[PDB]
Design a binder for this molecule. Structure first.
Ligand SMILES: NC(=[NH2+])NCCC[C@H](N)C(=O)O
Ligand SMILES: NC(=[NH2+])NCCC[C@H](N)C(=O)O
Ligand SMILES: NC(=[NH2+])NCCC[C@H](N)C(=O)O
Ligand SMILES: NC(=[NH2+])NCCC[C@H](N)C(=O)O
Ligand SMILES: NC(=[NH2+])NCCC[C@H](N)C(=O)O
Ligand SMILES: NC(=[NH2+])NCCC[C@H](N)C(=O)O
Ligand SMILES: NC(=[NH2+])NCCC[C@H](N)C(=O)O
Ligand SMILES: NC(=[NH2+])NCCC[C@H](N)C(=O)O
Ligand SMILES: NC(=[NH2+])NCCC[C@H](N)C(=O)O
Lengths: 78, 76, 79, 77, 79, 79
């Protein structure tokens, strides 16, 4: 769960950012679904869910955790 | 096929954060359920985006994500 | 010239705009959301944190203090 | 799989074929959901599937043809 | 106006064509494949069984007796 | 280069291979098809006309006279 997420964050996370309740994660083209799957499988209590595009993932924070808090957690896992 | 029928077939779970309802579906079903939501033309829904097993439904102010998630849950 | 390409694709592909909070919601013809989102990404707007494309909808996340309504208005006019 | 049979009943709009391919049509957005049930049925004469938005390509395992697969999907429906 | 819209979008979006067996393989800019494939579907060509779009590639399935090469040639002429 | 990067990702992402006629069918973990297909495309193999990625399956289209079977043997060898 968390170990596979941690590994893929190091492999696939290009950058992180945030706005309100959202963490925005950027990946190489095509990698968003694969990294998002790993986040989903980790089932973090402070993550409501994720949605992946092609190179971008929106991670929705569970109140009171903020998007900036999740972005910094992800960032420091790279 | 109508949202009101497909919610019972395709909704795994509902949750919320701020102005977003977060719906989960079985793998691969998100676009199909989200299409039904879009077609429902709900006054309180600004729009939806589907991934593979997750839909984000955007609430129209002042409706909250929790209010929307409650409705989706209740109509399952 | 990311902005010029985005401008012209908005003209071709942007059906409507709407918003809520920190989100602009852009509608496009079926299947076009990824192509328009790519152009928005490439313009690299300071007021945009990122985009997710679905099939006929793009969610554009606004960079604070810009609101969704403010982003939506900008897209609506570049159209 | 009877789970695949029910979703074909529900979501299969039409079938067609060319060569080693069966081409399945679904309502908009439904292709991945139906293809998932096909994959899970693990049919011996199916090598694999790819889903688009409203179309699935189903690859026939030699010597089975696309036509034979399309006929099989028509039947189950 | 399906065939006419399809021709216009091929001019805009078709980067290259190629073939193998019963398939025409169409290449587009990143993200554009679903939108072009939609235009092809809606044209309802008698020599096309169906399309599947990825991100930057479309597979167009030729209806017998038309080969993938004869289909790709048709698209190439509209590039 | 692109072939080296592709080979490394095959080791990580290729669950199985199979073939039919001109097609090689590669299976990946869920969600990984687009990323492995991107690496294959970037490698620009002369044997490969093109790829389409689904969610866990990639269809790799062989450039004639290479067959699907030969393509799959190739990917298997690089894993
Ligand atoms: N090759 C592409 N599809 N590019 C556009 C990606 C648009 C958006 N950032 C997403 O991940 O959904
Ligand atoms: N099989 C997969 N694609 N899994 C990843 C899904 C990631 C995210 N929950 C979404 O639905 O977009
Ligand atoms: N043909 C479809 N996939 N329709 C559903 C679209 C659902 C949602 N508005 C999105 O763009 O992701
Ligand atoms: N713009 C898109 N992602 N279109 C394809 C729809 C998603 C997926 N292939 C499905 O049938 O559910
Ligand atoms: N709304 C759309 N994406 N339509 C285009 C679908 C293109 C192609 N038939 C596929 O299913 O992949
Ligand atoms: N990894 C992804 N699902 N990327 C987005 C695919 C783009 C979409 N199939 C289109 O051509 O418009
Ligand atoms: N950004 C990406 N998803 N790139 C990979 C594209 C893979 C394959 N050519 C397709 O269109 O499905
Ligand atoms: N319903 C969807 N759009 N699913 C996207 C699947 C993930 C992506 N196409 C991949 O190659 O792994
Ligand atoms: N979660 C899913 N989308 N599962 C269905 C995958 C269907 C098909 N094998 C594809 O990769 O396109």
């Amino acid at each position: 769960g968390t170990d596979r997420m941690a590994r893929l964050l190091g492999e696939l996370l290009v950058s992180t950012d945030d706005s309100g309740n959202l963490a925005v994660l950027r990946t190489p083209p095509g990698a968003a679904h694969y990294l998002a799957s790993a986040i989903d499988r980790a089932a973090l209590p402070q993550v409501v869910g994720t949605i992946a595009g092609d190179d971008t993932i929106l991670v929705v924070a569970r109140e009171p955790t903020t998007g900036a808090q999740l972005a910094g957690m992800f960032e420091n896992l790279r």
